[PDB]
Design an enzyme around this catalytic site. Sequence first.
Site: not given
Ligand SMILES: [Zn+2]
Lengths: 113, 112
Positions: A6, A99
């Site tokens: 983030c 990811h």
């Molecule tokens: Zn995150």
Amino acid sequence: MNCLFCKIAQGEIPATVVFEDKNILAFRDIRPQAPTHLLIIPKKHIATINDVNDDDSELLANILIRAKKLAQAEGLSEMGYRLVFNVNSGGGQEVYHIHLHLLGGRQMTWPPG
Amino acid sequence: NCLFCKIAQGEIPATVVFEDKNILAFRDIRPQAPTHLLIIPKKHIATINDVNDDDSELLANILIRAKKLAQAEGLSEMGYRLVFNVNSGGGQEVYHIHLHLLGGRQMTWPPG
Ligand SMILES: [Zn+2]
Ligand SMILES: [Cl-]
Ligand SMILES: [Cl-]
Ligand SMILES: [Cl-]
Ligand SMILES: [Cl-]
Ligand SMILES: [Zn+2]
């Protein structure tokens, strides 16, 4: 809180960004395991693949589609490459924001870890 | 002439763990982990390099089915790894796309 990915997606930690759209970001893994090693992430925070339900499944598929487009843009697709999702510690996941790994630039071998 | 089309259609037997109109999942006969499943679309797509945006529904289905199979296998919390090999340098040998689901041991880094 304090999610590394983030922070990258929010411009707070330097990274080499190779793709961005309204929903998805791709950047280099700082510890590359192959001559080219890229990460494709949602901008939305989702901790693991187990937390993707039907309302985020299109986003997850679009991460995969973006990875295949990016592999072409980065010159990996003709020779070939590997795509990996790790899930939880036993799967090798360390950062708890989903990811997709894109690894290429050499022959990938078997087993895949 | 496609091995995975033949498996998808029942012309070659496999150790099937899931089937619907769109997807078949079966155990890899050379397993690299205690759990090693292959999840294939019944639709023939030769390589991930051929994927298009109209594949998003099918690819979401494959990935969600992998998540659900990992849960039923007991791997959700223990952990697991999903792998696509793309073309020869990625390790692909059969030219019909297939997602590997691996778990039941610690998966290591690098991933080959
Ligand atoms: Zn995150
Ligand atoms: Cl791209
Ligand atoms: Cl069926
Ligand atoms: Cl589908
Ligand atoms: Cl299932
Ligand atoms: Zn086929």
